[PDB]
Short mmCIF file of C-alpha atoms and ligand atoms in Angstrom, two decimals:
data_model
loop_
_atom_site.label_atom_id
_atom_site.label_comp_id
_atom_site.label_asym_id
_atom_site.label_seq_id
_atom_site.Cartn_x
_atom_site.Cartn_y
_atom_site.Cartn_z
CA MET A 1 20.75 0.26 -32.24
CA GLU A 2 22.62 -3.16 -31.95
CA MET A 3 22.57 -4.74 -28.29
CA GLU A 4 26.25 -5.03 -27.21
CA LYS A 5 27.13 -1.49 -28.23
CA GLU A 6 23.90 0.15 -26.83
CA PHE A 7 24.92 -1.90 -23.59
CA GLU A 8 28.39 -0.22 -23.34
CA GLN A 9 26.65 3.20 -24.06
CA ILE A 10 24.15 2.77 -21.24
CA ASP A 11 26.97 1.68 -18.88
CA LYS A 12 29.25 4.60 -19.78
CA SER A 13 26.42 7.00 -19.53
CA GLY A 14 24.83 5.44 -16.28
CA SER A 15 21.29 5.59 -17.52
CA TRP A 16 19.93 2.19 -16.82
CA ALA A 17 17.45 3.65 -14.39
CA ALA A 18 16.08 5.96 -17.00
CA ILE A 19 15.70 3.25 -19.72
CA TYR A 20 13.90 1.07 -17.28
CA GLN A 21 11.51 3.68 -16.27
CA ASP A 22 10.71 4.38 -19.85
CA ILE A 23 9.84 0.76 -20.24
CA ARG A 24 7.54 1.11 -17.17
CA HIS A 25 5.70 4.18 -18.62
CA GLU A 26 5.11 2.62 -21.97
CA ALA A 27 3.96 -0.81 -20.75
CA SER A 28 0.28 -2.06 -21.44
CA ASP A 29 -2.46 -1.72 -18.81
CA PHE A 30 -5.34 -4.18 -19.04
CA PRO A 31 -7.90 -4.98 -16.72
CA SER A 32 -7.48 -7.67 -13.93
CA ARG A 33 -11.11 -7.81 -12.54
CA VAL A 34 -11.13 -11.54 -11.69
CA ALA A 35 -7.94 -11.42 -9.67
CA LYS A 36 -9.41 -8.72 -7.43
CA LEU A 37 -12.71 -10.28 -6.59
CA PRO A 38 -13.06 -10.83 -2.87
CA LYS A 39 -13.23 -14.69 -3.03
CA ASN A 40 -9.74 -14.70 -4.56
CA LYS A 41 -7.92 -12.85 -1.92
CA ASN A 42 -6.22 -15.80 -0.42
CA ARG A 43 -5.20 -16.96 -3.94
CA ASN A 44 -2.85 -13.97 -4.40
CA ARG A 45 0.41 -13.63 -2.86
CA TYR A 46 1.06 -9.91 -3.52
CA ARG A 47 -1.82 -7.43 -3.87
CA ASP A 48 -0.08 -5.60 -6.63
CA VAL A 49 0.74 -8.67 -8.90
CA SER A 50 -2.38 -9.95 -10.65
CA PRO A 51 -2.84 -11.67 -14.01
CA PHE A 52 -4.75 -9.67 -16.86
CA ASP A 53 -8.27 -11.18 -17.60
CA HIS A 54 -7.41 -11.66 -21.35
CA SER A 55 -4.42 -13.94 -20.77
CA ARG A 56 -4.97 -15.59 -17.57
CA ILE A 57 -5.03 -19.33 -17.07
CA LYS A 58 -8.43 -20.78 -16.32
CA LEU A 59 -8.76 -23.88 -14.19
CA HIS A 60 -11.26 -26.58 -15.35
CA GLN A 61 -13.56 -26.20 -12.60
CA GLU A 62 -16.91 -24.69 -12.36
CA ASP A 63 -16.81 -23.40 -8.67
CA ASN A 64 -13.81 -21.15 -8.98
CA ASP A 65 -11.51 -21.25 -12.06
CA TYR A 66 -9.04 -18.69 -10.70
CA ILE A 67 -5.05 -19.00 -10.48
CA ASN A 68 -2.50 -16.34 -10.49
CA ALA A 69 -1.08 -17.31 -13.71
CA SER A 70 -0.62 -15.86 -17.34
CA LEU A 71 -0.15 -17.28 -20.74
CA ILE A 72 2.59 -15.38 -22.60
CA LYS A 73 2.43 -16.50 -26.35
CA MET A 74 5.32 -15.26 -28.61
CA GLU A 75 4.06 -15.31 -32.26
CA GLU A 76 7.26 -14.79 -34.28
CA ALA A 77 9.48 -16.81 -31.92
CA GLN A 78 6.87 -19.66 -31.82
CA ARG A 79 7.26 -20.24 -28.20
CA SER A 80 4.79 -20.15 -25.23
CA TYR A 81 5.32 -19.95 -21.56
CA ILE A 82 3.04 -19.85 -18.50
CA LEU A 83 4.28 -17.48 -15.72
CA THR A 84 2.86 -17.80 -12.15
CA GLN A 85 3.63 -16.98 -8.59
CA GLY A 86 5.10 -19.44 -6.07
CA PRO A 87 2.39 -21.53 -4.89
CA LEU A 88 0.68 -20.64 -1.47
CA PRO A 89 -0.48 -23.17 1.28
CA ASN A 90 -4.15 -22.93 -0.19
CA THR A 91 -3.14 -23.07 -3.82
CA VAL A 92 -0.74 -26.17 -4.20
CA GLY A 93 -3.51 -28.21 -5.46
CA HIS A 94 -4.56 -25.69 -8.01
CA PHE A 95 -0.88 -25.36 -9.26
CA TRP A 96 -0.64 -29.14 -10.01
CA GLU A 97 -4.23 -29.03 -11.60
CA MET A 98 -2.92 -26.31 -14.06
CA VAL A 99 0.12 -28.35 -14.85
CA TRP A 100 -2.10 -31.49 -15.62
CA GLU A 101 -4.80 -29.62 -17.70
CA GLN A 102 -2.29 -27.49 -19.80
CA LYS A 103 -0.17 -30.67 -20.53
CA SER A 104 3.24 -29.24 -19.47
CA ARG A 105 6.12 -31.34 -19.28
CA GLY A 106 8.44 -29.06 -17.16
CA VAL A 107 8.43 -26.72 -14.33
CA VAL A 108 11.15 -24.16 -13.78
CA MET A 109 11.63 -22.76 -10.15
CA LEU A 110 13.92 -19.79 -9.77
CA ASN A 111 13.73 -19.14 -6.12
CA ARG A 112 14.48 -20.95 -2.91
CA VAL A 113 11.52 -21.91 -0.37
CA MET A 114 13.10 -19.66 2.14
CA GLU A 115 15.08 -16.43 1.20
CA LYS A 116 15.95 -13.56 3.46
CA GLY A 117 14.59 -15.27 6.46
CA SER A 118 10.93 -15.49 5.11
CA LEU A 119 8.97 -18.10 3.10
CA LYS A 120 8.76 -17.16 -0.61
CA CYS A 121 6.59 -20.28 -1.61
CA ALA A 122 5.09 -23.54 -0.28
CA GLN A 123 6.93 -26.76 -0.24
CA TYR A 124 4.92 -28.20 -3.01
CA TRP A 125 6.91 -31.32 -4.13
CA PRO A 126 7.97 -34.28 -2.13
CA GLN A 127 11.41 -34.40 -0.83
CA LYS A 128 11.72 -38.24 -0.41
CA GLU A 129 10.58 -41.14 -2.73
CA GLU A 130 8.68 -43.05 -0.16
CA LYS A 131 6.66 -39.89 1.07
CA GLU A 132 4.41 -39.04 -1.64
CA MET A 133 1.92 -35.99 -1.77
CA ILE A 134 -1.80 -36.23 -2.11
CA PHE A 135 -3.85 -33.06 -3.06
CA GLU A 136 -7.36 -34.03 -1.91
CA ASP A 137 -9.10 -30.75 -3.24
CA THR A 138 -8.03 -31.62 -6.97
CA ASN A 139 -7.62 -35.39 -6.78
CA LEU A 140 -4.01 -35.58 -7.76
CA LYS A 141 -0.94 -37.68 -6.44
CA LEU A 142 2.60 -36.69 -6.86
CA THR A 143 5.82 -38.87 -6.25
CA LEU A 144 9.48 -38.15 -6.53
CA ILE A 145 11.23 -40.60 -8.85
CA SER A 146 14.83 -39.34 -8.89
CA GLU A 147 16.86 -36.16 -7.89
CA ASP A 148 20.18 -34.94 -9.43
CA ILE A 149 21.85 -32.19 -7.39
CA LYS A 150 24.46 -30.10 -9.07
CA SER A 151 26.44 -26.86 -7.95
CA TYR A 152 24.02 -24.28 -9.43
CA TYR A 153 20.77 -26.20 -9.89
CA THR A 154 18.76 -29.29 -9.26
CA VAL A 155 16.81 -31.58 -11.61
CA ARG A 156 13.99 -33.88 -10.40
CA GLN A 157 11.92 -36.49 -12.13
CA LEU A 158 8.30 -36.39 -10.75
CA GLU A 159 5.17 -38.47 -11.39
CA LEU A 160 1.94 -36.92 -11.49
CA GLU A 161 -1.20 -39.08 -11.35
CA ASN A 162 -4.86 -38.08 -11.94
CA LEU A 163 -6.58 -40.14 -9.36
CA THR A 164 -9.99 -39.72 -11.22
CA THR A 165 -8.74 -41.60 -14.44
CA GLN A 166 -5.50 -43.40 -12.99
CA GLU A 167 -3.61 -41.70 -15.89
CA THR A 168 0.10 -40.86 -15.09
CA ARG A 169 2.67 -38.46 -16.57
CA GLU A 170 6.13 -37.67 -16.07
CA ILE A 171 7.01 -34.14 -15.08
CA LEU A 172 10.57 -32.55 -15.02
CA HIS A 173 11.36 -30.18 -12.16
CA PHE A 174 14.34 -27.56 -12.99
CA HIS A 175 15.37 -25.78 -9.91
CA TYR A 176 17.86 -22.93 -10.12
CA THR A 177 19.20 -22.69 -6.51
CA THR A 178 21.84 -20.05 -6.58
CA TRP A 179 20.33 -16.73 -7.33
CA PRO A 180 21.53 -14.39 -4.61
CA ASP A 181 19.17 -13.17 -1.80
CA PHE A 182 19.92 -9.43 -3.00
CA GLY A 183 20.79 -8.28 -6.56
CA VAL A 184 21.52 -10.34 -9.57
CA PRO A 185 24.36 -12.83 -10.46
CA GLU A 186 27.72 -11.26 -11.22
CA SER A 187 28.00 -13.56 -14.45
CA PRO A 188 25.28 -14.90 -16.61
CA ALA A 189 27.08 -18.20 -17.23
CA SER A 190 25.34 -20.50 -14.79
CA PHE A 191 21.89 -19.12 -15.84
CA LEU A 192 22.59 -19.71 -19.42
CA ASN A 193 23.83 -23.23 -18.71
CA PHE A 194 20.45 -23.85 -16.87
CA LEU A 195 18.40 -22.33 -19.52
CA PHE A 196 20.28 -24.68 -22.11
CA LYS A 197 19.47 -27.81 -19.82
CA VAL A 198 15.84 -26.87 -19.77
CA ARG A 199 15.84 -26.59 -23.58
CA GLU A 200 17.61 -30.01 -24.17
CA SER A 201 15.05 -31.72 -22.04
CA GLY A 202 12.10 -30.95 -24.50
CA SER A 203 10.14 -29.06 -22.05
CA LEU A 204 10.24 -25.89 -24.15
CA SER A 205 9.17 -27.59 -27.36
CA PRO A 206 5.79 -27.55 -29.25
CA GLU A 207 4.97 -31.16 -28.71
CA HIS A 208 4.21 -30.40 -25.08
CA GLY A 209 2.11 -27.69 -23.46
CA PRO A 210 3.60 -24.67 -22.21
CA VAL A 211 6.40 -24.79 -19.59
CA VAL A 212 5.40 -23.35 -16.12
CA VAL A 213 7.91 -20.84 -14.90
CA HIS A 214 7.83 -19.24 -11.25
CA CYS A 215 9.75 -17.41 -8.74
CA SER A 216 7.98 -15.71 -5.59
CA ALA A 217 5.76 -13.07 -7.66
CA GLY A 218 6.35 -14.73 -11.02
CA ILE A 219 7.45 -11.53 -12.91
CA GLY A 220 11.11 -10.69 -12.02
CA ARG A 221 13.43 -13.58 -12.33
CA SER A 222 10.79 -15.39 -14.24
CA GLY A 223 10.79 -12.50 -16.69
CA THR A 224 14.42 -12.64 -17.20
CA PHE A 225 14.35 -16.43 -18.05
CA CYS A 226 11.62 -16.02 -21.01
CA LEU A 227 13.14 -12.82 -22.25
CA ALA A 228 16.46 -14.32 -22.68
CA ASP A 229 15.00 -17.54 -24.25
CA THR A 230 13.03 -15.57 -26.68
CA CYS A 231 15.59 -13.18 -27.60
CA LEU A 232 18.19 -16.01 -28.42
CA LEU A 233 15.65 -17.79 -30.56
CA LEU A 234 14.86 -14.84 -32.56
CA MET A 235 18.59 -14.26 -33.19
CA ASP A 236 18.68 -17.77 -34.68
CA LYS A 237 15.69 -17.52 -36.86
CA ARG A 238 16.33 -13.99 -38.47
CA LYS A 239 18.64 -13.10 -41.32
CA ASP A 240 19.78 -10.12 -39.67
CA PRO A 241 20.46 -11.02 -35.74
CA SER A 242 21.42 -7.43 -34.86
CA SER A 243 17.77 -6.49 -35.59
CA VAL A 244 16.70 -8.24 -32.24
CA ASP A 245 15.49 -5.31 -29.89
CA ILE A 246 15.30 -6.59 -26.38
CA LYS A 247 13.34 -3.65 -25.14
CA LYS A 248 10.66 -4.19 -27.82
CA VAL A 249 10.55 -7.97 -26.90
CA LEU A 250 10.07 -6.99 -23.31
CA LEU A 251 7.24 -4.53 -24.08
CA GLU A 252 5.58 -7.25 -26.27
CA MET A 253 5.71 -9.77 -23.15
CA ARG A 254 4.28 -7.13 -20.95
CA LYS A 255 1.09 -7.30 -23.03
CA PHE A 256 0.54 -10.64 -21.31
CA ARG A 257 1.72 -10.11 -17.79
CA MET A 258 2.36 -6.90 -15.72
CA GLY A 259 5.70 -5.97 -14.12
CA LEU A 260 8.03 -8.33 -16.05
CA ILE A 261 11.65 -7.44 -15.12
CA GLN A 262 11.40 -5.83 -11.61
CA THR A 263 14.55 -3.64 -11.40
CA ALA A 264 17.15 -1.83 -13.64
CA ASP A 265 19.57 -4.33 -12.39
CA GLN A 266 17.38 -7.21 -13.91
CA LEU A 267 17.12 -5.39 -16.99
CA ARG A 268 20.92 -5.00 -17.34
CA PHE A 269 21.44 -8.78 -16.48
CA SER A 270 19.03 -9.69 -19.24
CA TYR A 271 21.13 -7.74 -21.68
CA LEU A 272 24.31 -9.32 -20.49
CA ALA A 273 22.80 -12.81 -20.70
CA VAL A 274 21.75 -12.43 -24.37
CA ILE A 275 24.93 -11.00 -25.32
CA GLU A 276 27.01 -13.78 -23.85
CA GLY A 277 24.59 -16.41 -25.02
CA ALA A 278 24.64 -15.22 -28.73
CA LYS A 279 28.36 -16.14 -28.76
CA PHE A 280 28.16 -19.45 -27.50
CA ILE A 281 25.25 -20.43 -29.82
CA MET A 282 27.74 -20.25 -32.70
CA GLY A 283 28.59 -20.31 -34.35
CA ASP A 284 30.99 -20.84 -31.58
C1 6SU B 1 16.81 -36.64 -12.47
O1 6SU B 1 16.04 -36.30 -13.57
C2 6SU B 1 16.84 -35.90 -14.52
O2 6SU B 1 17.70 -35.42 -14.54
C3 6SU B 1 15.94 -36.35 -15.75
C4 6SU B 1 15.14 -37.43 -15.70
C5 6SU B 1 14.49 -37.68 -16.84
C6 6SU B 1 14.67 -36.91 -18.21
C7 6SU B 1 15.65 -36.08 -18.21
N1 6SU B 1 15.78 -35.40 -19.47
S1 6SU B 1 17.22 -34.56 -20.08
C8 6SU B 1 16.62 -33.74 -21.39
O3 6SU B 1 17.62 -33.57 -19.21
O4 6SU B 1 18.03 -35.67 -20.34
C9 6SU B 1 16.17 -35.66 -16.99
#
């Protein structure tokens, strides 16, 4: 079926939970043996969220190459994304090592450091220009260059230096600051505006390594971001945009990381975002 009318048909019939459970039943199951090794317990935020072995990002290190991060490679859309958990106190150095080694331009953050009165990820970037951060375990230095605070999101320019080689690179930090503590946003308008700002920066383009996207577990809000982006790109590429099937795209992405889209409310929000986004692209 088309999307917008499949949408109204699920709303009127109140069957979002049944649609979402079908997705969960059909989703791929692949091994994640490296994630479950005892030496990696303090590298995982949640015991039930792990990268598959076949698609995990490897650190360029001979001691321990493990990070909780996955490469989502979308062949028809010609887009790639790295989805990862919010960094932990003992993985902030690994996080920036990955950004460096994978040649990423942008980092997309969809959570606040504290939500619901608890810590959802480490404070992994500097908050003042004159107070830079050094990660001694991976030999990197990170400096805040500039910060632009808007009503729904903040953009930061950061400098990452590889202290071994003295090479430097500019990294863009895109921080969506207004996702509610419970549920999903009422309108997708600010989330779509944010997606378009990431796109306009070059961070999603083939001349760079894959964008790094995270929330707390790296599967819920993060899944919504890459699902909406890929569906809108396919609607631009194809002769028949109504052929884009958001459930099929989601199942394809779940071949590369488990659990993408965590609730039926997130599934409904993803439909809403793609539907509204397709009108703004045009032609309008
Ligand atoms: C404050 O940092 C920024 O907003 C910033 C800095 C440097 C470059 C960009 N790129 S763009 C595509 O959003 O125009 C943004």
